[PDB]
Ligand binder design. Sequence first.
Ligand SMILES: N[C@@H](CCC(=O)O)C(=O)O
Ligand SMILES: N[C@@H](CCC(=O)O)C(=O)O
Lengths: 408, 602, 408, 602
Amino acid sequence: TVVVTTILESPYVMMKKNHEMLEGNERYEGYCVDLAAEIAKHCGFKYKLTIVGDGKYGARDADTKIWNGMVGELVYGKADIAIAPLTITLVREEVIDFSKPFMSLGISIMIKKPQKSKPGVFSFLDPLAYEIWMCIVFAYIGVSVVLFLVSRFSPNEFGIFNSLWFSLGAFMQQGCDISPRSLSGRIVGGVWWFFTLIIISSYTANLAAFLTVERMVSPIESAEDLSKQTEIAYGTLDSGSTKEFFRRSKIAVFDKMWTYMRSAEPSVFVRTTAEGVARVRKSKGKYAYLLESTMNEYIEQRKPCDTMKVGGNLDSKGYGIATPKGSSLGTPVNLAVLKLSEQGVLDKLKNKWWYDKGECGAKDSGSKEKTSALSLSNVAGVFYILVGGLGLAMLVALIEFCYKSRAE
Amino acid sequence: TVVVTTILESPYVMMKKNHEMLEGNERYEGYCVDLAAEIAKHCGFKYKLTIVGDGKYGARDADTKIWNGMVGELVYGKADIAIAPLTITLVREEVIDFSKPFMSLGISIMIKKPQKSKPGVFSFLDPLAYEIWMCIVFAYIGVSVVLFLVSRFSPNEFGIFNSLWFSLGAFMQQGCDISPRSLSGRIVGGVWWFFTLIIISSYTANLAAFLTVERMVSPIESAEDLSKQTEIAYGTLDSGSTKEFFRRSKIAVFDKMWTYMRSAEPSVFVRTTAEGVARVRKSKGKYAYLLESTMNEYIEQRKPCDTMKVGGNLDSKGYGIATPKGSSLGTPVNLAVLKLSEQGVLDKLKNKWWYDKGECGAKDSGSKEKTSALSLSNVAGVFYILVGGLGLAMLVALIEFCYKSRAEAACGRKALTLLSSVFAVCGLGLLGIAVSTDYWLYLEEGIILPQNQSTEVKMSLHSGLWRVCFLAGEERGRCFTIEYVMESTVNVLKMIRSATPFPLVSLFFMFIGFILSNIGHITILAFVSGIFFILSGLSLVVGLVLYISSINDEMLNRTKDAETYFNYKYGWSFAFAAISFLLTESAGVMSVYLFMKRYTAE
Amino acid sequence: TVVVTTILESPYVMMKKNHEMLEGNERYEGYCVDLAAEIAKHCGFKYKLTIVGDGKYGARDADTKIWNGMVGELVYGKADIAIAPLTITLVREEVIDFSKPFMSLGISIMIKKPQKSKPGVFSFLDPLAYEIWMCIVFAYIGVSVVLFLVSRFSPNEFGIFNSLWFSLGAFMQQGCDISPRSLSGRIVGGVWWFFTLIIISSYTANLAAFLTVERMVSPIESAEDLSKQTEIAYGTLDSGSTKEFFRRSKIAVFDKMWTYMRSAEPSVFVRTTAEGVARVRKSKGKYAYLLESTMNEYIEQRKPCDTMKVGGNLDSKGYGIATPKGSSLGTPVNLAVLKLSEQGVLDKLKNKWWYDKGECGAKDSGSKEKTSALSLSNVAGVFYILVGGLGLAMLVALIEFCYKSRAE
Amino acid sequence: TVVVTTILESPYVMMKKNHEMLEGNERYEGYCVDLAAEIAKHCGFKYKLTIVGDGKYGARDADTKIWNGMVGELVYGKADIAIAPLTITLVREEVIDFSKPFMSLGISIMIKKPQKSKPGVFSFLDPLAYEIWMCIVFAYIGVSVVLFLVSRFSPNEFGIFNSLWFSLGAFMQQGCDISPRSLSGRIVGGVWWFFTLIIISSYTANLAAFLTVERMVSPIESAEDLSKQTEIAYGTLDSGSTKEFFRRSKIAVFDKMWTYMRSAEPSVFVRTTAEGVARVRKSKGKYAYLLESTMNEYIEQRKPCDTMKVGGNLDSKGYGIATPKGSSLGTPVNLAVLKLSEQGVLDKLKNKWWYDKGECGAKDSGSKEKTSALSLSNVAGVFYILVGGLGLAMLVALIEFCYKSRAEAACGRKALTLLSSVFAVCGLGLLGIAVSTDYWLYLEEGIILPQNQSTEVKMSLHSGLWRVCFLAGEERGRCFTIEYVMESTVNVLKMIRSATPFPLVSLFFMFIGFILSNIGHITILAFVSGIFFILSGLSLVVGLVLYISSINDEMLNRTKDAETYFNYKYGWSFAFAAISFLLTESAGVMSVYLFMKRYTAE
Ligand SMILES: N[C@@H](CCC(=O)O)C(=O)O
Ligand SMILES: N[C@@H](CCC(=O)O)C(=O)O
């Protein structure tokens, strides 16, 4: 009777393992398969699912005007009914009819879900801000300055070269041989002692908080951070909606997109959705793939779990049944679309099929971690400051010999 | 002239600075106001603006269901063309006509922006209690006093200035100058070391306890977190489409929302958006609100800058020009909707009203590098104590320079002999005052009232250890002894009785020690009396620790109910005990000053 | 037509506020009210809900044989049908008939849900076991013993009285004036230094773990811990099942119960279920109340939240509709009971009514806490060891003077 | 004779030590075996025992549904009276007859008992990495070497034995003896203090990180926790009533269980209880099991003592004597069920078989005082290093006593002059060996196989910095240079190139320093050559830190997949570099020994 045109994409149309073994009509399973079983039943018709041989979404060719992938089977009459995840757009509706939307979707960003980021060489000073480290320095100066001035007007081992050394080890938790032996002096060392005792305890407590609780970094989100960050390479699928909708960029943010989307190398587009899944997993911070929302949702729910949806829908779009213009069975479908939507067969099977394939959620966030031993990379910059301090130490040893030899 | 109805909504429909000066259609301003002209210019007509008499979009009840809002205005022929931020839904679709959606939108959560709140200028001392910080100082005094008494015995560099200084560096773990070379001095030096070992580690662990719990605070955003959390109230605008959206939903997390917003109390359904704006502002993040993204974006662009969006857009509806079933001119509108979209005149204006209000100054752009590193305001008071310690040391450096020069250019003895004995009098006097009062402490039990409403004290009283005289408990003036009963305060008053003897032990020794100081004026008389001043003060500290910690026992032992607030405080007789403590600790050393002075005379 | 006998107990039969204002038949609401509306509908009959005037579960009187509370209305014929939360037992079934059970329940223990327990005076040494504190002591001894023996055979400020003082401050993180000046000596101080540096860091890390993560204590559970602990006072309701089922104690654990249950003071029983709710909330560790399971479940789900179910069912029991022996409508109910159970109206309304009244669960466990400042009670015993060390210090000062004065 | 069928189940039906010697009904033993006699004595009959040919209780399929198990045995008249732990349910009720339940029971969870597992004898050093502990020692050496070179210059108590000792106490924060009184000595003393300040605090915070996460581990027990957690697999006995219970359930947490156990792979449904006992024992708590309480209690009373019950009983069924529809003698059974319950003969036996097996020794009674305080086995190795440090110090105390006495009763110089120069040879030799090899490290990438199955190494290789010679990567013997490519290991090999110059800087200085040591044998020749030994060793440590940390970079940079296991290791040329490091650091000081010796000669 009727000819079904569609394409195999998860979770819509999915081949199982044993399609060579047993076919029946169960070569393909999914939400879109059973929704086609609903819409054929409510119309009464019986289907022949024929996925297109070229295997593309498709559009009419630029300057050649030939409908490519599923639009070729739908316009040129070799297929009639189309239960397919295809975008309703203007030039889509211009040549052939569509039904009501399956669901409310839009363009979503797919990034790699990051692992533990690499700390820098100076990541040891992470619990304290630059201002606090700087305020310690001027405090370290001013205390020994005061101790120099306190020891000036009272009868003397406390030179300006000496009082630096006392206040340093007091900050470094080390005891010193010479102690103040004056009331005004011992006030200054005491408040300096009570200073550092807070600070060392403060640095220890914040550092445990970084180790125990971990916060995850999302460098790019909400599509404005995409517009500023131009080290990420955007990706979409061509021969379809995301190509032309950004080719029809009119918002100033989308203009900054499409100028950069044309000026990119080499992945201005890709040609397979599963490739754009694989390419982001190989990209690792350099590249991103914009696509349909519920696809990015679903691939996140299939568990390699290294993916993430950020931001939100950049458009409002809907999946409707494509029918040729002046369809034999369009208005039969149009009523039977309303028969699905009136009680939510569109809702209820989508309730089932979206949670069906397993979940990637708060299951692995809770108790799939152990804190590790500290890497050398955590504490590496301490050694470079150490050996760099060792390198500077030998240099002062040489220039000591020069000014000592000028006692001639 | 065609009738155009609108609702007052920013930036769609605005007022005017010439609010009553100005005339006609020009009297208002806004995005759709220009879009009304865009239909008017493209089709070539004049329009007559009106306002909805209700002030709501559309309501439909289990009723004759005549629509309360802009729908029934347009239904009953009162309106001709409706130009509004109106949601295109199926229930509206069957009764009126929409054009193509000229705007894309979603359900959005608006909350109070979690702001940088006030830190403490003394936030560093928060992991310990101020009771403990007071007891540390009291421990710091007496140990130095005991060590001096141990060291400077009758037949050694450990002066009282040294013993203060040695105990300080031992507490600060910064080493020391010298060590005690006598067994009892090594006894007191050891027990001070085990003291300071715990307390420093006690402070460090609780400081990490503040920080780790703070990072384990997770800002709820995903709307499933909002669904599971009854601490945050969430409500919607009534008579809209958001209210209708959660009504007929088949998402299980939406169903619990609509169930919870059904059974809520008080009514979370708010008549106008501006009050739903306001109820978020009043609750300080206790209450949350659900609305469309575009309004939630625009209020974010305004400059109180205290409202932000969390989570993602729940669905994708649209705003469309509304016409009744049978409008002839709504089809050239459907021409004009497509053409101005293809011309981008929509996007010309939908840019225009939105990027214009950068009057918030992009507070989100410069305040989302949030790291859990400390700020200076976390540790500000430590620098204050530092430089405040410096200026005192500068002041001592000045007054040393004067006083040393004047002395170099017997008279001290009989004055300090008079000073030391009168120090015992004020110590004996302040303990005599403190015991007799019924004002050693404070106690207050009441219930709080939730919504911006003053607290109600159920029962209140001042008390001492002997007698209890109520203040607002039945407004009853019974100076009522504890042996006569009168429910958790009853158990408080019984535990006060356990702290009885150590103040009474204290009073006996000082009266002996003071009267033996006068007989010393009439030697060993002065010598042992200083020990009675110290043995009193040891019973003071044990008396204070029993007093304070047993209150802290029954503090937590109160059944914690959220409405039952609590306050307590110590009284002036508590402060009278501490002042009387220091003088006996000081003048007891001054006996050892005078005894070693008089042993030189002997 | 029919006379309904029952009693008002939450969540079964519950008066609202405005029962004086509006009655209709909605004076009483609950699961048991609507289940009575189900069983009257499936039978066809129409009800008159009459809660008994005495207001008791009841039984026949010991040595007097008069049915007391609801058994009086059911046996003596003034009431016919009984949709009531009443236990099916032998002597219950002996005189009048019952239906199939509403649900599978049993005897459950109701304890107070404890708050933060009071720490002891010696709770500061909680992160380290008694063995570890003891092993430090013998380590503290043996190191100074070795240092005494090391300093013996090598040329001497290290007496046995001295080497205790060095190794102590090294354990107490304090620097000492005299250091070892021999290779075999400096090995011992070095490994002693590396000893304590682990230990102080170990004590700090465990103490933060006690403060950050809190574990809740359940002193009594699983009904064997009830059988050993005899500081808790058990409570049940008399004139009913829990009285006689423990009066029919045959298990050796229940014998230890019922010997103690008879030998108790004063609450051998109480007479109101809500009193047993209130009495445990006033008991605070001294007393417990055994009762029906789904009651203890429900009162836990009503939120004062200071209650807890521990252990499990100590019996298997069921709620059946009481009917007089040779009932007019028993077999009509018996089929209509099966009409409820065949599709789970018994299940589905119990699904609704049990989650209906609000929840007390993981909602307050997660984020309704802040760690407080340390109390003085946390650190009190440090002061008593301190002042007790101060008390012992003065005593050695006196006995020093005695042996000094014997230089005569 | 009446036919009595049973299933083999402890302690209901047991085998015999006279397994083939013994005859008839006596051939087995058990609880119901005695209860079979209790019916037999009370009614007055003989019985004929049989065993079910299937080995299961009862199965009912979408089928002709003839019951596979003890039901269809009793259905088809093969059995007369069934005495078994059989569940009384409605589906069984309509087809056969039950008496009153003689036992009360519930669904129970049996898991592997979470046991006291093995701690580490070196568990203390776990918050840091052994890479770091090696680098701390290497830092501890060279800083002492640098400080000595700084101190003992050409024109002071800081000997090399002191500089080792001063650096130790500074690292242990236990104070020091004296301080450097020269600016470059204060420079090196300061930077060592800032070194040890971080590392100690770094160790303490990560030690708390192990402990807090361990307490945040919550043992899942409530069966809702089990329902949400896919890490623990949970399955039931098939052809029973537990399988039928979750099938027709209207509790939403039960529905997810039955859904999850539907869609599971492999089959969690287990034919016999003893294999369901065993699959828990094999998985080591990865797999869980659902059964009745009474069996779960009895296996707990047995003595492997590794099985415990968590949570509560989900329902309340009963065990009842099963008779077909139409059994005449099942009604005197219903007499005998009531009478022996009223006589407590049931409770006589139901006590008897249960309290008898106290052969576990009540392990639950003495092992549930679990507190998060440390054990000795947590910190055992620290006592080992302590006493192991003592016995070495005792050994030095002996060999000091001999060597000092013999010396007291020029010859040292020319020997140590020979020792010092040959120390440079072995240092130059071991660096010459280490660079040329392709064995500096180890690398291995493979996938693991889940169920007790050996790991599969996908690709493996040994390598150096210059060349890479594979081992099991295609089993290919290419000593393949890194400039020729060949996916994460590719990025490993590129980062190895960044660590190139500092070993090459190292080799140049030692060859200069050694050949200048020989020309010193042919002064300042020996003096500056020691600095070239030290400046080499500084480039060693920077060379090692670049080498180690960049591996740790690409260690974590591997995409963590649960099947992809990983191992890496360093090679002997890595250990050859460390041995060559110490000799040049030692003999460089020995140049300063010999120079100050020869400056005395000069
Ligand atoms: N645009 C919405 C506003 C009210 C709502 O969000 O429910 C409407 O007209 O229905
Ligand atoms: N007593 C149970 C054992 C099997 C099960 O627990 O499902 C029965 O016979 O059905």
